[PDB]
Design a protein around this ligand. Structure first.
Ligand code: CU
Ligand code: CU
Lengths: 620, 620
C-alpha cells in the first residue's frame, strides 16, 4: 500500500509492455536505466500513481530516449528523443563489458601491439572503461569506451596482476569500430601472479581462529512491514533500492514520545567517482563514475549468510530490469540487522553511590557492489541516541599499471615491475532534509578562539559562531578541520523546550576533496567533488550532483547548474549534498587483494530532543 | 619470569617494607604514586631487576620525596627531597577528596555564602578540584584544592543538576586552612533533578530490545601466558597497568612468517587534560589533568560481565598501592576479548569467476575509569591486517554551572537555568616506536596538487611529498587535513622486498587542538596540547608530555623542555607524542547523563609487509 514500497517484478513487466507496445522496445533497443520515481510533494495526492523513469538505448544507432511511464494506469507520460552530444550519453550497458575486447580482437593495430609484446589475443582481457571528454572531437555524439589490457594466463587467473602498459585503445560500441589505438612503447608485463586463493601465495591457512557466534534467541528487535518499512527502537523508515544509487532510505523519522518526528526525507549516495592522478597518456583520461556511468545498484552482490552478514539477518531481494525489460531479482542483495555497539552511557557517582551502565546498539542497512576490479560496501547506521551514520568500505583489487624504471611520482610499486596509479574514491551523499518538517536552514559552525584581555583575563575562553546560509550562491562550503567546522540543519519554526530551534549536526571526516587542477575536465564534470558541502533548494528534477547523463558529458552539469539559480534556502525545503572520499596511494599491503578501508560521515542531534532520548533504555 | 609482568601484591608489600626499613615510610607518610619501572634499554643487566618508583607525601607538612627502589634486591636506589614550589606538587590523594567539603563546612565565609542562598550545608557537596597556577602568590609551595558547590537534595540525588554558581573557595589541604572564599553574587540554583534512574524522568523502560547473544563455543582465539602476555592472530604484546597512565601496551610485535617483528615498544596515554573555556572567575581556572593530577588508573572501574564487556571475556585484575603502601586489587579492571569486525577483504571477479570474501576481527584491550563527573573508556585495538588503533570514549555527567539570564558565548543551556561550560578533553598518546627495531625516523607526508601544463596536460595528476624530521627542533608538527597530512614512522635500515624502508602511517582525526590563548597558564602547562605531533629522542626520564609533577606546576618541564635538547631523531630510538581530543559544546542530548562520544587515532602498515598479511585467513 505504501507509495514507497520496493518495485515488484509485476511493475517491471508492465513498464515493459508499455514500452514495446508504444514501439519503444524494438529488437534494436536496450534499457540502460529503469527505476521507480518517488511520490510528489504533497499529501493531497491521494491514491498513488506508480511511475517509472527509463533510458532507452538503440544498438542500431537511433537516438536514445528518456521515457516516463505510469504503471498505475499503464500509459506513457512522456517520451523524448535525446541529443547525447548536448545532454550526455546513456550509462554503460553490462552487455558492452565484452564488446571492447571482442572488437579489438579483429583490429590489426591492436594485434600488432600484442604481437610486439608476444601476447596471445585469446588471453588478453580488456576492461570496458568510461571515456570521459577530451580533445577528440570525433567522439562527440558517439558512444565510446576506452580499453586497457590485462593478461589472464588461465581461466581462474587474476588478470589484474598482468597489466599491459604503454597501450590503450578507443572504440565505438554502436558503430562497432576502433577509432584509435595508441602505443607509447613496450613495458614489461608484470610476471608475478596475484591469485589470492593459490596455496603457494596464501601459504598454509590459519587454524588459530576460533568461532564467534552472534545470535538472537528471541529474534530481532526491528519489525519489517509493507515489505520494506522498518521500525526499530523509535526509528521509522522505508528501505528503497535504485539500480543507479543502490540502497536509498526514505522517511527517516524518530518517535519522540507521542509523535513521529521526521529528520531526513531521503538519503542516498547520489554519485561516486574514482579519478586517477597518473599523467601518463595511457591513463590520464581515467575517471570512473561507478554510480553515474556504470550504475552500482545493478551490480549488487547476493550476500551469503555467515560470510557477508553475520548474526540474525533479515534480507531484501530487490528487483530490477534487465537490458530487455525483464525483471531480474537480486537475491539477498540487502542486509538488515541490529548489532551491539559497546557502551552507550556510564557513570559511577561518588556522592549518590549509584553505578549506572547502558549498552548501545545500531540498526544496519547495507549492500555490497562490484564494478570491475572494485568492490564497495555501502552501510547506513541508525543509533539508539539518534545518530545517523554512513560508511563506505572499499576493497577489491587495485587498478594496476607497470611500475616505471626510475620510479614515479604518481604511481606506487606493489610487486616487481607492478605499479598502482594514485587515485581517489569520492562520494556525494544527497540528503533531502526534513528536520521536524520541510522548513529547514543550514548554518556553518566554526569554533572561535578568543584573545586574552578584558573579559578574558586568563585567556582560557573559547566560543563558536554560526553563519546561516541564506542563498544557494553562498551555500558551497569547504571544510576547516582546524576550526572544527560542522554544519547544522535546523528548523527555525520548531523549537525544543529550551526555546531553541531543533537541529542535527553533520560531522565530516574532512578528507581531501578533488585534487585535479581546477581547469581539468574532471574538475568540470565532477565539480561537486571540489567542495565539501553544497545546499540547494529542493527540485524534483535535481537528483544527482553530476546530472542525469554523466557519460561523456562536457561538464558543468548538476550542482554547478542548480546552484546558479541562487534560490532561497533559509527556512525552505532544502537538500544537503556532502562530498567525502578516500585519497589512495596504494601500499604493498593492498596487493594481491586489498584489506577494507573506510570513509563516511554522521549526523548527531543538536538540541533536537529536550533531553537524552535514551533514558528509557533498560539495564538489560 | 617476564620483566614486563604486572606488579604483584607481594611486590607492592615489599616496596612498603623496603621503604619502612629505609626510614622513608613513617606513620606521617603517604604514597601518592607508586609504579613499576620498565626494564632499561639493552641487556645491560645479567638478570632481572624490578624497580619501583614512588612519590611520598608527608601529612605533617614536611617535604615530599621521589624514591626508586629495587624490590629484587631490597634496596633504595635513589631518594630525593622535593621542593614542590619549584618542581610541582604531588598528585591529588583520594583521601583528600572529602577534605575540601569538610573544612569549608565550618568556615564562616562559606556558611555565609550558603546562608545567602538558603542552602543547608549538610546538603552541599563540594568537588575537590585541582588548582593549577594563577595569581595567588600564597599558593606557591602549598598543596591547594579549589572547591565548587553542588546541592544534593537526598542521598541518591545527582548533585550535578544543582550547581551553586558565583561561589568558589580555595583550601590548603595540608594545614587544613580555607585560604579564600570568593562570592561574586547569587545565582538561581537549577531546580530540576537529573536522576536518570527515576521513573518520573525515564518514563516506562523499553520492552522492545531483544537480546544479542555473543559467545565463543571453543573459547577465545588468543592466549594469555605469564599473567599478561597476549598472543593473537600473529600479534604479540604484554599488557601492563600503571596507576597514572592506566593500561600500557608493551612490546607490540607481529609474527611475519618465521620472524617476530617489533612495531611499538611502548604505547600509552601519557596525559589527558580537560581545559574549560568559561571566562567566569568561578571556573576560568579549571583545567583537569585527569592522568597527571588525579591518576586515572587509580580509579579504574571493576567491569561487570555481560554489561561492561560483552562476549567471551578474559579479565586482568591489576594490583596497585593504597595510601599506606598496602596492595589493593582492582577486580576485573581490564577486559580482553576479540570481536568480529565485518568484512576484511572481498572481490567478485568478472574474468576469473572467483568470488572471494573474508571477515575481519580485532583484539580489544580496555578499561574504564571515573574521575568526579567524568567516566572514560580507554580502548586499544589490534586488527588482522596489521592496523593498531586507540579509541577514547567519553561519558558520565557534564560539569555544570548556572545558565546566565542573558545567554552566554561560553556556556550551553541544558535545562531551565542549568548550564554546561564549553571545554575540551585532550589526550596525549606516547608511542615509543620500534618499527622492525629501534632505528626509526618520522616523515611528514602531504598530498601534493599539480598544475596543469607540460608533463600534466590534462591536469589530472596529483602526488605527495615526504619530509624527514631530523632534529627535535623541527619535529613539532601541526595537522593539515586539507592536504591529507599523515606521519610515517619507518626504519631506514630495514627494507621490504621492493627495496623500500618498512613503515607505519599514523592517521589522526585532525580535531582542533588546545584553543586557549597562547599566553594563558593552561597553554604553558599543557603546551603539548597546542600541537598535533611531537617527536623526541628516547630518554629514560622523559615519560610524560607535562613532566613528573603536574599539580600546581607552572611551565618549565615536559615536551617543550625535552625538545630543547634538539637531539638527532633521523634513524634513532625515537618517541612519537600525538595530541588528539574532543571539543565539547554540550547539547541538551548530553543531559542528564551523556551518551558516549569518541576520538582516537590509528596506525596502518605502509610497506611494512611484502604483500597483504591476511592472505592466510580462512573462508569463514
Ligand atoms: Cu583505491
Ligand atoms: Cu565533555
Amino acid at each position: 500500500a505504501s507509495p514507497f514500497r520496493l518495485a515488484s517484478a509485476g511493475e517491471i513487466s508492465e513498464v515493459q509492455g508499455i514500452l514495446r507496445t508504444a514501439g519503444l522496445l524494438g529488437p534494436e533497443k536496450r534499457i540502460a536505466y529503469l527505476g521507480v520515481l518517488d511520490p510528489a510533494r504533497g499529501a493531497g495526492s491521494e491514491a498513488e500513481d506508480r511511475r517509472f523513469r527509463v533510458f532507452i538505448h538503440d544498438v542500431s544507432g537511433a537516438r536514445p530516449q528518456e521515457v516516463t511511464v505510469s504503471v498505475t494506469n499503464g500509459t506513457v507520460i512522456s517520451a523524448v528523443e535525446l541529443d547525447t552530444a548536448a545532454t550526455g550519453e546513456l550509462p554503460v550497458l553490462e552487455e558492452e563489458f565484452e564488446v571492447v575486447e571482442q572488437l579489438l580482437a579483429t583490429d590489426e593495430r591492436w594485434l600488432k601491439a600484442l604481437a610486439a609484446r608476444n601476447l596471445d589475443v585469446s588471453k588478453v582481457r580488456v576492461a570496458p572503461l568510461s571515456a570521459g571528454v577530451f580533445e577528440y572531437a570525433e567522439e562527440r555524439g558517439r558512444r565510446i569506451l576506452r580499453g586497457l589490457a590485462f593478461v589472464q594466463d588461465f581461466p581462474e587467473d587474476s588478470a589484474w596482476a598482468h597489466p599491459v602498459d604503454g597501450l590503450v585503445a578507443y572504440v565505438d560500441v554502436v558503430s562497432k569500430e576502433v577509432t584509435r589505438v595508441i602505443d607509447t612503447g613496450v613495458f614489461p608485463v608484470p610476471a608475478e601472479h596475484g591469485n589470492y586463493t593459490d596455496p603457494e601465495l596464501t601459504g598454509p591457512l590459519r587454524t588459530t581462529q576460533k568461532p564467534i557466534s552472534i545470535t538472537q534467541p528471541e529474534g530481532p528487535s526491528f519489525t519489517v512491514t509493507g515489505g520494506n518499512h522498518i521500525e526499530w527502537e523509535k526509528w521509522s523508515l522505508d528501505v528503497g533500492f535504485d539500480v543507479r544509487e543502490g540502497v536509498v532510505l526514505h522517511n527517516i523519522a524518530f518517535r519522540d514520545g507521542d509523535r513521529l518526528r521526521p529528520i531526513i526525507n531521503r538519503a542516498s549516495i547520489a554519485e561516486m567517482v574514482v579519478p586517477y592522478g597518473d599523467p601518463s597518456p595511457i591513463r590520464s583520461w581515467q575517471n570512473y563514475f561507478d554510480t553515474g556511468e556504470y550504475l552500482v545498484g545493478q551490480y549488487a552482490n547476493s550476500l551469503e549468510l555467515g560470510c557477508d552478514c553475520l548474526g540474525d539477518i533479515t534480507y531484501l531481494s530487490p528487483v530490477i530490469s534487465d537490458a530487455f525489460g525483464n525483471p531480474r531479482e537480486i537475491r539477498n542483495g540487502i542486509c538488515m540487522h541490529e548489532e551491539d555497539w559497546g557502551i552507550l552511557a556510564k557513570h559511577s557517582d561518588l556522592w549518590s553511590g549509584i553505578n549506572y551502565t547502558r549498552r548501545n546498539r545500531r540498526m544496519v542497512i547495507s549492500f555490497f557492489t562490484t564494478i570491475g576490479n572494485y568492490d564497495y560496501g555501502f552501510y547506513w547506521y541508525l543509533y539508539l541516541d539518534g545518530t545517523i551514520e554512513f560508511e563506505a568500505k572499499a576493497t577489491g583489487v587495485v587498478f594496476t599499471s607497470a611500475f616505471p624504471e626510475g620510479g614515479s611520482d604518481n604511481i606506487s610499486q606493489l610487486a616487481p615491475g607492478l605499479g598502482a596509479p594514485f587515485h581517489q574514491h569520492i562520494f556525494s551523499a544527497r540528503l533531502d532534509m526534513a528536520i521536524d518538517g520541510f522548513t529547514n536552514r543550514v548554518e556553518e559552525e566554526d569554533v572561535v578562539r578568543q584573545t586574552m584581555g578584558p573579559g578574558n583575563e586568563r585567556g582560557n575562553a573559547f566560543s563558536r559562531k554560526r553563519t546561516v546560509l541564506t542563498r544557494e550562491s553562498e551555500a558551497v562550503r569547504e571544510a576547516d578541520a582546524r576550526t572544527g567546522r560542522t554544519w547544522i540543519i535546523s528548523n527555525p519554526e520548531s523549537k525544543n523546550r529550551l526555546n531553541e530551534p531543533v537541529g542535527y549536526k553533520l560531522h565530516a571526516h574532512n578528507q581531501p576533496t578533488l585534487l585535479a587542477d581546477p581547469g581539468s575536465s574532471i574538475a568540470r564534470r565532477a565539480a561537486f567533488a571540489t567542495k565539501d558541502l553544497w545546499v540547494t533548494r529542493y527540485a524534483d528534477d535535481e537528483r544527482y550532483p553530476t546530472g542525469d547523463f554523466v557519460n561523456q558529458h562536457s561538464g558543468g552539469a548538476g550542482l554547478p547548474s542548480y546552484i546558479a539559480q541562487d534560490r532561497d534556502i533559509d527556512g525552505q525545503d532544502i537538500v544537503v549534498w556532502h562530498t567525502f572520499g578516500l585519497t589512495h596511494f596504494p601500499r604493498v599491503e593492498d596487493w594481491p587483494i586489498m584489506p577494507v578501508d573506510t570513509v563516511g560521515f554522521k549526523l548527531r542531534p543538536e538540541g533536537f530532543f529536550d533531553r537524552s532520548p535514551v533514558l528509557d533504555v533498560p539495564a538489560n
